[PDB]
Ligand binder design. Structure first.
Ligand code: CLA
Ligand code: CLA
Ligand code: CLA
Ligand code: CLA
Ligand code: CLA
Ligand code: CLA
Ligand code: CLA
Ligand code: CLA
Ligand code: CLA
Ligand SMILES: CC1=C(/C=C/C(C)=C/C=C/C(C)=C/C=C/C=C(C)/C=C/C=C(C)/C=C/C2=C(C)CCCC2(C)C)C(C)(C)CCC1
Ligand code: SF4
Lengths: 61, 41, 160, 735, 80, 180, 30, 85
């Protein structure tokens, strides 16, 4: 995955679970949740972006 | 008359016009053929 | 006949209801003067009451013991104009409404600002879609066949 | 402030009055108590069951004693259709002379008995105020037995283990066979031996029962197989109940219908019914496996039931351990079954009155039906609440899942959105259209043109009535036809009795129905569907949702999740129960309103009033409530009072409690905490009262406690006002 | 006293700490995020349960969670 | 899928006639709620064979007057069933038992989701060696003839029922079967 | 009409059932 | 043990250790005979002859009980046949 890639959220406790988002940036450092994904639908708190782990996102073909 | 027509395209004005037209043709059907309990055919 | 009811053309209580309503209207008519608009209005009321009662009598309508038309909605085509034909008419109209709404939602859902086009309707596109709903039974059974009517697993689900 | 909630140290350290309030409301939640094990849980529940059965038996003994002492049972025997049964005497110092005179019955002021116990005890063969006293004595003895057993099974060497408590097969075998079948067998024995001769004038007491043969042939036909002999010579159509005139010698018969005199089921019919039920249940009690190598292991039955094509997942494999290890699943099942059973009692004890002269006791009929329907609604709501509790605290997804695939119960949480969406659709459909038709009738009738009403004949339900033999709708279907195989088959067994009762205008057996019945049945269906929607949504969403995907971590009952993310009011599963209680009360109110108005019109004779005015809402409001409330409100006026004065007082009391519930429901906390703080300052800063100080800091009631208190006020006021209305209206309208 | 837990989804944006009305949360060094900081709850005895901390949390389902528990004159906000 | 199955001929072009796409709804949403094409084809064969037998059984008794000796002489299929149900109950019972046995042995229940050991209307049943040794195209042609004749018999029986219910629905019917 | 002896002994038996109730109540602990 | 199954037919252990050892060629015809006998007994106690107090005939009653049973016998016959028995 990279910037601009489309991924499916696999985190169950997510307002965008099973949904598709756009990767903003994948951090190359040793952070726990490097993948930053932007969504079109705001969550219940109003935010439309979140940091996800490498195993919590699945790239769409 | 470019933004006025856009204003008339807003949800409230369009809904009011559509519901006014709808109530109008319903009321006029019931005036010209009143007391219709069953299908006319 | 059906359910112990009898036709309203032979229901004595139905004619009693008609006579009582006409008598009340005429008694009201007595307290006005000449060809004044109140008398014209009451006379129109009497005429409409008589026409409505006559039409209900000659309508294959079954009346109970209260002299009121009862609807036979078990499904028989004999009394098909009471429920079945209005049912078909409503199903057509409501399917039209739902189809045009769904088509508009899916059409402006692929534009740059889908939410803007929902409070500010694209009247040209709206008119284009709305007059295309007369084929909603055919369009529905041409989009269901192609799998374009139902989502499969992109739909969201709660935690459990 | 260190020893009231002995079961909870967290509450005992609360410095406020909330500790006292929560100590009451958590006393029976044994699973949440401090230092808690499963063995202690089951043992305490067992002892509590014993104490509860003792309480029930003591209550019945008290009813028996008060009827025997202050009632007029013996006088009511000689004239059951004119003498009004007396429940108990009244001694209230607040009475004036007028109240004493109005409530005076025979020798002392007394309350009429609306429980129908007089008819029930008369039917089962009681004729003396000494028979009731014997029953009270025996029931107090039984209560003592149960209390002793409850104490005993908390003793060290007599406390059962978890294996004994979870021994499903043994308990089922014994419950079914012993409890149901043997109790039915003993009840058939009593019915025959005592009740059958007592209805025929022969007294069979605890002295001449070993020498008075229940049948002249005396157990010879039973062993000989000539079982028809017990049905020969039944009671004639001119039999006077309690007297030998026109009686018979049969003890087990098919007659169908009602006694021509008492307008109730034949005693020989009920004895035969209980004998058949006893045989069936004794047979069915041998199904499950015990120490003798034959029977069923229900774990195997549940595990083997997976459809081969595969539509229920893996089937019921994990259900045995799920139900066995959860006391809330079993409690929910029992409550649902009890709710259905008491709904059945309500629906059958008015259509098929089983007790002598109970059909002509209109106030007791209305009271019994209303009581049982309200109990039914309560039991159903409790069943769903305990299902939600099971989901929160007892459900284990791992047990109900095998290699990713989910069992029959775990799959209910997968299409939970489908279930809730379709319940919502049905509720909206029924509500929209029932209200639409009702308001259409309202407007059309109001405009003076009732002929334009939408009146749908309930043909489907009238079809069922014709199928059972009612020749009123000209259907000629199954039992309305004399040539159908259904009629020829029983033409010699129970049709002549059944047809004579179903085709009678004075019965409540299959009351004639019209468009008003159709509309009110659709209203009832809407109420049932909406209550089910609320309860099912709370149960399925108990473990979490999108707004709270960790709701299981907060328990069954918690106030909320806070003020952000949108809001979070009434998000717990307990709040779903709390909301569904209102809908249960509304649905039971609709059911009882329909029943009471239909039967008031039937008894008064103006059934045309219901058939015409029941199709529109103003008809209900004007002809049921406004019309029949006149006798009740005139229970006391500026001119005098009647024996109905207590019912008017209860009417106003119910209204007051209802509106106090409105207080507790509309106004929330936070507004009551600051006011309490002002009161606290006032008390602390005033002389002559500073000498007295509280030990528990006064605080406002918690959010959940406030919801409970408002619901309790709402429900108590609802029940009291409707009981007062129904009883007083029936009494004051029908003499 | 209420229970406050911090989860490694913390991004160290400090909005929880500067929203606590009773000084329960504080920022401590960490190596699990870009900011190098994580929220801590070392003074939960002063926690009142107002949940302002998790109203300011930007992470998806929160990184600070408040579990209401036993009540105290400090946790009940009693000035008397 | 329909391109490689027996049933289409020159009458509907060269393509399988399926205006409503009913053959392709099995693969659509749901594990299985709508029949597979195999179930539909087995229903084809069963309905067509039953319709051919019923056409013979309304023509031969009702028109030609041929009757089994101890059976009611009722040239009317709307009453013959009941008349024989009373007159010869044992015969009708044996017919029902034979039908039940034949169908139970040739159960088609795995055809709903597709699959099974049998073929569409296999049934064995080749006593007089009509397909003893033939080319594959010849067997396919014979199967197509059977299917088309079954469809024609379906149409004829539907026409019988329609004319009995709505008089005048089939104009030439009473001029082509002069007796009832 | 029941006698004084009948009511009196029923009251006495009720007392015995009361002492059995507190014993069960106290055994279910404070 | 392990009555749970996922194949085409359940294992013969679900029939109990009395039907697990009956050949299908015995259960099948026995099931058909029991069904026919039960149907005839039901149609002789009722339907063909109307029931009466004096005519109960424990043979027809007991017989009729073979109809519900028949269902179980042929279910077991199919289970045995599919399990090569
Ligand atoms: C928007 C819906 C609608 C539609 C389809 C019609 C349709 C019609 N109107 Mg009409 N009308 C409407 C709304 C509508 N009206 C409203 C909102 C008013 C004001 C209250 C009127 C007032 C009105 C009058 C005063 C008359 C009509 C008349 C008519 C008829 C001939 C033109 C025709 C059937 C005429 C008619 O048929 O009367 C003879 C006529 O004289 N209309
Ligand atoms: C649960 C059953 C029950 C109920 C609800 C009542 C109700 C009543 N009884 Mg009563 N009574 C009962 C059983 C019951 N009785 C039994 C079994 C006896 C036989 C000993 C009596 C003997 C009796 C007499 C002699 C008198 C009453 C009277 C009364 C009335 C005033 C209350 C009173 O003085 O009580 C007094 C009750 C007793 C002395 C007997 C004890 C009652 C039972 C045994 C206890 C039941 C406890 C219950 C299950 C739960 C207790 C809850 C508690 C822990 C708070 C009231 C209507 C008075 C009356 O008629 O006034 C008009 C009166 O003078 N009762
Ligand atoms: C023959 C032996 C026997 C008998 C008589 C009982 C009897 C009882 N046991 Mg019990 N038990 C037994 C053996 C037995 N047990 C064994 C062997 C075990 C160990 C495996 C247990 C373990 C056990 C436990 C753990 C508990 C009991 C409890 C109870 C009591 C239940 C409450 C009550 O009073 O219900 C009375 C009920 C009736 C008289 C009948 C109810 C009638 C129903 C509601 C009507 C249904 C009719 C119909 C189906 C309605 C539907 C209509 C239809 C068309 C579908 C009851 C006294 C409970 C209790 O309260 O303990 C004190 C309890 O907690 N038992
Ligand atoms: C035999 C049936 C049965 C049994 C064994 C239980 C048992 C239990 N229930 Mg349950 N429940 C039942 C029926 C039953 N319930 C029904 C029918 C309903 C629907 C109304 C409920 C609704 C329900 C809820 C919503 C909850 C429980 C809970 C519980 C558990 C704790 C109970 C507790 O703390 O009591 C506390 C007892 C009280 C607070 C006393 C309340 C008394 C009420 C207000 C009536 C008193 C007023 C009275 C009528 C005065 C008259 C006024 C006068 C002027 C006329 C316990 C396992 C709770 C739990 O946590 O489960 C795990 C819980 O949250 N149940
Ligand atoms: C939701 C339930 C419901 C239903 C099924 C009906 C049904 C009906 N109402 Mg009614 N009504 C309802 C709710 C309902 N109403 C409510 C809630 C109220 C209170 C506001 C009223 C107040 C009301 C009045 C005051 C009157 C009716 C009348 C009528 C009848 C004539 C309908 C009509 O104008 O058809 C004709 C119109 C159409 C069929 C419109 C569709 C035509 C389209 C354009 C066809 C185009 C496609 C081709 C019909 C039986 C009238 C009547 O005669 O009663 C017998 C009448 O006078 N209703
Ligand atoms: C019928 C229903 C009802 C009743 C009785 C009350 C009663 C009251 N409300 Mg109200 N309230 C209601 C509905 C009701 N409300 C609803 C629906 C809402 C929702 C908006 C509110 C919202 C509301 C607010 C926001 C406030 C009140 C306040 C008050 C109190 C005013 C002070 C007063 O008169 O106390 C005296 C009590 C009474 C008049 C009640 C009857 C008492 C009887 C007549 C006398 C005493 C009886 C005696 C003690 C009985 C002992 C025997 C018993 C132990 C068996 C009072 C308790 C105010 C408050 O806190 O008090 C200052 C206040 O700020 N209420
Ligand atoms: C029992 C009724 C029935 C059924 C189930 C079928 C089923 C089938 N036909 Mg068929 N057919 C029938 C009657 C029927 N036919 C009759 C009466 C005719 C003569 C007009 C034909 C003429 C015909 C042709 C010419 C062809 C088929 C073909 C097919 C297959 C693909 C179409 C399909 O899925 O239809 C499914 C159909 C149904 C589920 C029946 C629904 C009927 C509804 C109730 C409406 C009926 C009244 C209008 C399928 C096996 C095609 C084929 O074999 O492809 C290789 C093909 O080419 N059929
Ligand atoms: C619950 C119904 C049921 C079930 C599960 C079975 C199961 C079976 N039958 Mg069977 N059968 C039934 C009823 C049933 N039968 C009835 C009523 C008859 C007529 C008397 C038969 C006649 C029959 C024959 C002649 C044969 C079987 C055979 C078989 C076995 C495999 C072949 C097969 O299924 O094809 C047969 C399929 C059917 C007969 C279809 C029956 C469809 C039923 C009637 C529908 C019922 C579903 C309905 C929703 C139930 C309502 C439940 C509740 C509301 C009451 C299998 C064990 C075969 C066998 O023994 O293999 C060795 C075999 O040769 N069956
Ligand atoms: C679609 C309907 C259906 C089907 C296909 C099955 C299929 C099966 N059931 Mg089953 N069952 C069903 C409905 C069904 N069940 C229902 C509605 C009940 C009642 C709630 C049961 C109760 C039940 C029990 C208790 C047991 C099974 C068992 C079995 C398995 C072996 C059955 C066998 O050969 O017994 C053959 C049985 C006999 C020859 C004896 C005669 C049985 C008759 C029907 C009893 C008549 C009396 C009764 C009151 C009516 C098999 C997988 C067994 C199992 O899985 O073991 C682990 C088992 O022990 N079933
Ligand atoms: C939440 C939950 C729960 C609960 C649930 C519930 C509460 C339910 C209910 C349920 C119900 C409440 C049900 C009901 C049912 C009913 C039925 C099922 C009925 C049936 C009937 C029938 C079938 C009948 C028939 C008939 C007829 C109709 C005629 C006459 C005769 C006969 C019999 C044939 C639980 C705990 C479990 C678990 C968890 C979850
Ligand atoms: S509740 Fe949330 S905000 Fe209030 S103190 Fe405890 S943590 Fe800080």
């Amino acid at each position: 995955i990279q910037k601009g890639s489309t991924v499916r959220i696999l985190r169950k406790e997510s307002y965008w679970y099973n949904e598709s988002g756009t990767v903003v940036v994948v951090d190359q450092s040793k952070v726990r949740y490097p993948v930053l994904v932007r969504f079109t639908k705001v969550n219940y708190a109003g935010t439309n972006t979140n940091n996800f782990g490498l195993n919590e996102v699945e790239e769409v073909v | 008359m470019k933004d006025f027509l856009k204003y008339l395209s807003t949800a409230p004005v369009l809904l009011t016009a559509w519901l006014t037209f709808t109530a109008g043709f319903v009321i006029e059907i019931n005036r010209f053929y009143p007391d219709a309990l069953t299908f006319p055919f | 006949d059906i359910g112990g009811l009898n036709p309203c053309k032979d229901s004595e209580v139905f004619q009693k209801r008609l006579a009582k309503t006409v008598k009340k209207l005429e008694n009201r008519l007595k307290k006005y003067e000449e060809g004044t608009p109140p008398q014209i209005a009451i006379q129109q009321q009497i005429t409409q009451t008589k026409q409505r009662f006559t039409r209900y009598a000659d309508s294959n309508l079954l009346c109970g013991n209260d002299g009121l038309p009862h609807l036979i909605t078990d499904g028989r085509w004999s009394h098909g104009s009471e429920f079945l034909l209005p049912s078909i008419l409503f199903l057509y109209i409501s399917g039209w409404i739902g189809w045009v709404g769904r088509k508009y939602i899916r059409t402006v859902g692929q534009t740059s600002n889908p939410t803007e086009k929902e409070i500010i309707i694209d009247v040209p596109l709206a008119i284009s879609i709305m007059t295309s709903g007369f084929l909603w039974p055919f369009a529905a059974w041409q989009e269901f066949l192609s799998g374009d009517l139902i989502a499969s697993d992109e739909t969201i689900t709660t935690s459990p | 402030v260190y020893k009231f909630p002995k079961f909870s140290k967290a509450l005992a350290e609360d410095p406020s009055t909330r500790r006292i309030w929560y100590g009451i409301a958590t006393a029976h939640d044994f699973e949440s108590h401090d230092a808690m094990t499963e063995s202690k849980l089951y043992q305490k529940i067992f002892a509590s069951h014993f104490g509860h059965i003792a309480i029930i038996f003591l209550w019945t003994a008290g009813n028996l004693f008060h009827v025997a002492w202050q009632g007029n049972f013996e006088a009511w025997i000689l004239n059951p259709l004119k003498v009004r049964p007396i429940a108990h005497a009244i001694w209230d110092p607040h009475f004036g002379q007028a109240a004493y005179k109005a409530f005076l019955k025979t020798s002392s002021p007394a309350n009429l008995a609306l429980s129908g116990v007089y008819e029930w005890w008369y039917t089962i063969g009681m004729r003396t105020n000494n028979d009731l006293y014997q029953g009270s004595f025996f029931l107090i003895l039984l209560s003592s037995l149960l209390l002793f057993a409850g104490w005993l099974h908390l003793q060290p060497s007599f406390r059962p283990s978890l294996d004994w408590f979870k021994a499903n097969e043994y308990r089922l075998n014994h419950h079914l066979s012993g409890l149901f079948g043997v109790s039915s067998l003993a009840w058939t024995g009593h019915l025959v031996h005592v009740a059958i001769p007592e209805s025929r004038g022969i007294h069979v007491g605890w002295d001449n029962f070993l020498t008075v043969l229940p049948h002249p042939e005396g157990l010879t036909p039973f062993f000989s197989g000539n079982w028809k002999a017990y049905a020969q010579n039944p009671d004639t159509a001119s039999h006077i109940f309690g007297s030998g005139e026109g009686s018979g010698t049969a003890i087990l018969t098919f007659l169908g219908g009602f006694h021509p005199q008492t307008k109730s089921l034949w005693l020989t019919d009920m004895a035969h019914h209980h004998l058949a039920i006893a045989v069936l249940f004794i047979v069915a009690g041998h199904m499950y496996r015990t120490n003798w190598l034959i029977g069923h292991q229900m774990k195997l039955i549940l595990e083997a039931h997976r459809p081969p094509g595969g539509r229920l997942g893996i089937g019921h494999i994990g259900l045995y351990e799920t139900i066995t290890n959860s006391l809330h699943f079993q409690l929910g099942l029992a409550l649902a079954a009890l709710g259905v059973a008491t709904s059945l009692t309500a629906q059958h004890m008015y259509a098929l009155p089983p007790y002598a002269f109970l059909a002509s006791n209109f106030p007791t009929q209305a009271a019994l039906y209303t009581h049982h329907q309200y109990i039914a609604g309560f039991l159903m709501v409790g069943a769903f609440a305990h299902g939600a509790i099971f989901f929160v605290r007892d459900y284990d997804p791992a047990v109900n899942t095998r290699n990713g695939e989910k069992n029959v119960l775990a799959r209910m949480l997968e299409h939970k959105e489908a279930i809730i969406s379709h319940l919502s659709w049905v509720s909206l459909f029924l509500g929209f259209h029932t209200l639409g038709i009702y308001v259409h009738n309202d407007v059309v009738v109001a405009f003076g043109q009732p002929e334009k009403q939408i009146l749908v004949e309930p043909l489907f339900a009238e079809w069922i009535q014709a199928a059972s033999g009612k020749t009123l709708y000209n259907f000629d279907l199954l039992l309305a036809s004399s040539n159908s195989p259904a009629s020829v088959a029983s033409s010699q067994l129970w049709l002549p009795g059944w047809l004579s009762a179903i085709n009678d205008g004075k019965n409540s057996l299959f009351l004639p129905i019209g468009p008003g019945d159709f509309l009110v049945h659709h209203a009832i269906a809407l109420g049932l569907h909406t209550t089910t929607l609320i309860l099912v949504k709370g149960a399925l969403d108990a473990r979490g949702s999108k707004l709270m995907p960790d709701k299981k971590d907060f328990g069954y009952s918690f106030p909320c999740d806070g003020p952000g993310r949108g809001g979070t009011c009434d998000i717990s599963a307990w709040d779903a129960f709390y909301l569904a209680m209102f809908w249960m009360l509304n649905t039971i109110g609709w059911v009882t309103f329909y029943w009471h108005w239909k039967h008031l019109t039937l008894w008064q004779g103006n059934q045309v009033q219901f058939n015409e005015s029941s199709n529109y809402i103003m008809g209900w409001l004007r002809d049921y409530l406004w019309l029949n409330s006149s006798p009740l409100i005139n229970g006391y006026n500026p001119f005098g009072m009647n024996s109905l004065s207590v019912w008017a007082w209860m009417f106003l009391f119910g209204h007051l409690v209802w509106a106090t519930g409105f207080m507790f429901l509309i106004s929330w906390r936070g507004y009551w905490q600051e006011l309490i703080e002002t009161i606290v300052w006032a008390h602390e800063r005033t002389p002559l009262a500073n000498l007295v100080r509280w030990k528990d800091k006064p605080v406002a009631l918690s959010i959940v406690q406030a919801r409970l208190v408002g619901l309790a006020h709402f429900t108590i006021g609802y029940v009291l006002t409707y009981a007062a209305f129904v009883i007083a209206s029936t009494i004051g309208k029908l003499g | 006293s209420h229970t406050v837990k911090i989860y490694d989804t913390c991004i160290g944006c400090t909005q929880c700490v500067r929203a606590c009305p009773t000084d329960v949360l504080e920022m401590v060094p960490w190596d699990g995020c870009k900011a190098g900081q994580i929220a801590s709850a070392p003074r939960t005895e002063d926690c009142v349960g107002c949940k302002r901390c998790e109203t300011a949390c930007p992470t998806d389902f929160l990184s600070v969670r408040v579990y209401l528990g036993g009540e105290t004159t400090r946790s009940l906000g009693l000035a008397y | 899928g329909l391109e490689n199955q027996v049933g289409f001929d020159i009458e509907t072009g060269g393509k399988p006639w399926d205006p409503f796409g009913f053959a392709g709804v099995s693969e659509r949403n749901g594990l299985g709620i709508l029949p597979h094409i195999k179930w539909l084809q087995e229903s084809e064969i069963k309905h067509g064979r039953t319709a051919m037998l019923a056409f013979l059984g309304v023509i031969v008794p009702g028109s030609l007057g041929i009757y089994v000796p101890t059976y009611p002489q009722e040239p009317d299929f709307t009453k013959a069933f009941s008349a024989a149900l009373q007159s010869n109950p044992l015969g009708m019972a044996q017919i029902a038992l034979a039908v039940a046995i034949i169908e139970g042995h040739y159960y088609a229940g795995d055809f709903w989701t597709g699959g099974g050991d049998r073929q569409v209307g296999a049934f064995g049943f080749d006593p007089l060696g009509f397909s003893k040794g033939k080319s594959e195209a010849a067997i396919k042609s014979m199967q197509l003839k059977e299917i088309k004749n079954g469809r024609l018999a379906m149409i004829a029986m539907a026409a019988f029922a329609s004319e009995k219910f709505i008089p005048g629905s089939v104009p030439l019917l009473h001029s082509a079967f002069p007796t009832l | 009409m029941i006698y004084d002896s009948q009511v009196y002994i029923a009251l006495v038996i009720a007392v015995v059932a009361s002492v059995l109730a507190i014993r069960l109540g106290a055994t279910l602990y404070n | 043990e392990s009555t749970y199954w996922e194949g085409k037919a359940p294992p013969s252990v679900v029939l109990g250790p009395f039907l697990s050892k009956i050949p299908s060629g015995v259960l099948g015809p026995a099931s058909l005979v029991a069904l026919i006998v039960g149907s005839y007994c039901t149609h002789e106690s009722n339907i063909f002859n109307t029931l009466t107090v004096d005519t109960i005939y424990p043979a027809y009653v007991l017989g009729s009980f073979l109809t519900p049973i028949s269902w179980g016998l042929h279910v077991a016959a199919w289970i045995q046949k599919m399990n090569k028995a």
